[PDB]
Prior knowledge:
The complex is a heterodimer of chains A (about 300) and B (about 210).
Chain A: H1 2-9, H2 25-41, E1 45-48, E2 52-55, H3 62-72, E3 80-82, H4 93-106, E4 111-113, H5 121-124, H6 129-136, H7 139-149, E5 155-158, E6 162-165, H8 177-180, H9 193-199, E7 201-202, E8 209-211, E9 218-220, H10 222-232, E10 236-239, E11 248-251, E12 256-259, E13 273-278, E14 283-289
Parallel strand pairs in A: 1-5, 2-3, 3-4, 6-10, 7-9, 10-12
Antiparallel strand pairs in A: 2-13, 5-6, 8-9, 11-12, 13-14
Chain B: E1 8-9, H1 11-21, H2 24-33, H3 47-53, H4 57-65, H5 80-86, H6 90-97, H7 125-138, E2 146-149, E3 168-173, E4 182-187, E5 190-195, E6 199-200
Antiparallel strand pairs in B: 2-3, 2-6, 3-4, 4-5
Protein name (chain B): RelA-associated inhibitor
Family (chain B): Belongs to the iASPP family.
Subcellular location (chain B): Cytoplasm; Nucleus
Amino acid sequence: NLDSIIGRLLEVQGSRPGKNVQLTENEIRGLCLKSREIFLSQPILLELEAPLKICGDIHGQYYDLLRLFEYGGFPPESNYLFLGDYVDRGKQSLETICLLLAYKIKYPENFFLLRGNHECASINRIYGFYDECKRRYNIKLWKTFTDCFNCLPIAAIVDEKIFCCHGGLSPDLQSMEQIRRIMRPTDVPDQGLLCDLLWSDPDKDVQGWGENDRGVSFTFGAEVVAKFLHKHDLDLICRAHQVVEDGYEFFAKRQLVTLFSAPNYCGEFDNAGAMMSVDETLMCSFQILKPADPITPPRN
Amino acid sequence: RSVLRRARLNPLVLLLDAALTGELEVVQQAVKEMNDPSQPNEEGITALHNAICGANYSIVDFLITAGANVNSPDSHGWTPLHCAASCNDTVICMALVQHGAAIFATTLSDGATAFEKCDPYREGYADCATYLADVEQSMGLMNSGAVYALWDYSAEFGDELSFREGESVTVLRRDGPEETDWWWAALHGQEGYVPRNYFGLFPRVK
Lengths: 300, 206
């Protein structure tokens, strides 16, 4: 059944962007239930090895996701880690999450999905995912997705050197055991470690920890990143969650990178998308997905 | 083959970021690892461009000394001299002019020269405009009229002069009315017309 589902999702590769793929309710529920098993069978704090391609927010922009695989290499030619925010804001959240869940089931050791702040019932109820489920399917299916999202892993460390999560650091985060001990399924709380990991942001102007303009969690400064990296013998923090004009954006010299993989974010920004390639030597390079925006003089 | 159980950046990525923020030693390290300091990214952005926009005089001098193409135009046709002029950065203009900048180079759009891109709304305009205005007027006059070729050229007419990159050419007649964009010049006893935009006041760094 999986191969049929993937095949139908990929059928629109040559189509004009916007064309839907309408799976059956039972098919989508199957993707959620089977992938949920895998998420719980794997660590909540993933330990991954290069080569790997790391992608940021997608936000239901399915045709940009297809271009992302087209340029990066469709699974399993490349290994993928996504940093969350698969639904909401875009018009095709369902096709996006289904293709990602489908590849997760087909290639469970070479394809990984982290939880973003929009993989939360209380958030994606608000910014479009519920609306899409209600329109194209029903509410019970949206609740089924919530059951799946509640089991997603929260962070990943690549070859003991690159720490990856959707949002950022936490003032409560002192030992990696604090992440491993989080039991699933779980909702995202209004505050605390799990909240901060998916909601906090870096800030060039804060020294230490500051209040976040979102009304949730904190901001952290460059010294926080430096202290964190030296403490855990890490080299780079890779996160998402914020739109960046070039698709990637460095912070604290080069100790942190923000990735965003949805070009022309909900048609309100002119940003490009990017993904980061890490080879077996841990060299990091960026690939850009950008939307569309000497001569001798004459003689007498 | 599954994936479930020190890190670096691309040298080109380090170079472009370090040139914009001002970490000289990092630029020096990146330059040694990569093969070409003038390497542009997917957006046409080069190391020297970021240094000019970032006003990092230290990095600009290093890259020029390291042989960065002082005339590479970006996707918009802007050369390093054009960006320095738009920022009224006289110091960079001097470094570029003194190291092989094409004084009469023009952009692909509207075909304007660096002098015309000085921003009268930013500080330092008068200092930058005066330098560029005098530099344009001094070519074929300064250094006994000697100018340095920046590219190879194969004559397109019998009354034109052929030359290779790096050769010194003497400008004899500048304000010739019959040709406003070419100069009557002399090279190894041969006289002929040469295009203004192919010469700089000093030679490239090779």
